[PDB]
Structure formats: structure tokens, C-alpha cells
Amino acid sequence: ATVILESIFLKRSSPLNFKKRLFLLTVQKLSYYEYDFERGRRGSKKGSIDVEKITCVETVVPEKNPPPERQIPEESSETEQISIIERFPYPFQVVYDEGPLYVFSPTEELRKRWIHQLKNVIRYNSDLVQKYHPCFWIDGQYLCCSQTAKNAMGCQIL
Ligand SMILES: O=P(O)(O)O[C@H]1[C@H](OP(=O)(O)O)[C@@H](OP(=O)(O)O)[C@H](OP(=O)(O)O)[C@@H](OP(=O)(O)O)[C@H]1OP(=O)(O)O
Ligand SMILES: O=P(O)(O)O[C@H]1[C@H](OP(=O)(O)O)[C@@H](OP(=O)(O)O)[C@H](OP(=O)(O)O)[C@@H](OP(=O)(O)O)[C@H]1OP(=O)(O)O
Ligand SMILES: [Zn+2]
């Protein structure tokens, strides 16, 4: 039940919005929670995914004109301290039965760390896919294949 990885990520998904969440990875589950900054501790649980139910973990093609909150910097005035909890420019994908979960990492190294660990723990899942969507699902379709089913088969082999 011990946590393998712990990070603050920007989580996405009608109405599409982005919230800061504390992500936890164990061998069994990935849970995400609210972060109580005022008291500096983990807050209320918001979601949990069975690791064995995950079918795909990959990066996502970055959006074209992203808001500052997802754009790399002024980090001379702002230390890494501020930017590492305000800027989340690197997205990756976590696909399970309900569909794709989109998560934004503050650094490339941290995304690399999480994708690597995730791949390790899902290595024996029965349903790993062979095709996936490298582009985000938005307003009823994937931007990579124009397919309008959230669980439509992937259009790219990797
Ligand atoms: O408005 P937030 O504080 O961002 O919470 C949202 C909101 O959930 P709540 O109604 O519980 O506040 C979303 O719900 P809708 O706007 O779809 O009604 C919900 O999505 P789901 O109910 O569809 O699960 C989403 O959660 P998620 O992105 O896990 O789907 C969840 O955001 P958080 O789960 O990240 O707090
Ligand atoms: O939030 P945690 O401290 O990680 O507690 C988890 C969590 O339980 P709750 O979030 O409901 O308290 C798991 O529950 P879910 O994510 O399914 O809702 C549950 O996992 P199981 O589904 O396998 O019961 C698990 O129980 P366990 O570790 O006995 O497997 C339990 O951990 P605790 O027993 O430490 O509360
Ligand atoms: Zn596609």
C-alpha cells in the first residue's frame, strides 16, 4: 500500500476545466486528491484508478496555443519553487475502461518518471492496447483521427 510516486499535477476532465491535484501511485492504485496548501498536507480524495484496469500510458501532442498555466516561462524572478507548482506544460495520457485521463506535468523529467513507473506496473495487464490516440479528445472527438467515440480504437501504432 506504500506510495511509489507522489507529485502535484494539473488534471483535466460538457465543461472542460483544469484542476491542481496531488497524485499518488502505488502498485495497486493511482489516487488523486485535493491538496491543502494552508496546512501543507494531503486533502480529500477525488479519484482512484485500478492499475490493472489501465490499458495505455503515453504522452499527448501538446496543444497549439496554451494558456500560461501550461506554458514554459521569467524564472529569474520566479524561482523554480513557484513555477513547479504553477506551470504544467507537459501532458501525458492514462487510458482505462472509462476512457483517457489527461494529466499535465510541470517538467519533462517528472513526466518521464511517471510514465516509466506506470508502464512498469501495468506490464501484465490483459488489455494493453496496440493502437492509441496521440491527440486529445475534445468536444466530442479525437483531434488525431476525427473519431467521435471516446472508446474508439486508436489510430496510431507505437
Ligand atoms: O468541479 P470540480 O471541483 O473541478 O470537480 C469536478 C466535477 O466534479 P464535482 O461535480 O464532484 O464538483 C466534475 O464533475 P462534472 O462537472 O462532470 O459534474 C468531475 O467529473 P466526474 O463527476 O465526471 O468524475 C471532475 O472529476 P473528473 O475529472 O474526475 O471526472 C471533478 O474534478 P475533480 O475530480 O478533479 O475534483
Ligand atoms: O484511501 P486509502 O487509505 O488508499 O485506502 C484504500 C482505499 O480505500 P478507501 O479510499 O475507500 O478508504 C481502497 O479503496 P478504493 O480506492 O477501492 O475506494 C481500498 O482498496 P480495496 O478496493 O482493495 O479494498 C484499500 O483497502 P486495502 O488496502 O485493504 O486493499 C484502502 O486501503 P486501507 O485498507 O489502508 O484503507
Ligand atoms: Zn486518434
TrEMBL record:
It is found in: Cell membrane; Cytoplasm; Membrane raft; Nucleus. Residues 63-79 are annotated as: Disordered. Transmembrane segments: none annotated. 1D-myo-inositol hexakisphosphate binds at residues 11, 17, 21, 32. Zn(2+) binds at residues 133, 144-145, 155. Residues 2-123 form the PH domain. Part of a complex composed of EEIG1, TNFRSF11A/RANK, PLCG2, GAB2, TEC and BTK; complex formation increases in the presence of TNFSF11/RANKL. Binds GTF2I through the PH domain. Interacts with SH3BP5 via the SH3 domain. Interacts with IBTK via its PH domain. Interacts with ARID3A, CAV1, FASLG, PIN1, TLR8 and TLR9. Interacts with MPL/TPOR. Belongs to the protein kinase superfamily. Tyr protein kinase family. This is Tyrosine-protein kinase. It comes from Bos taurus. The gene is BTK.
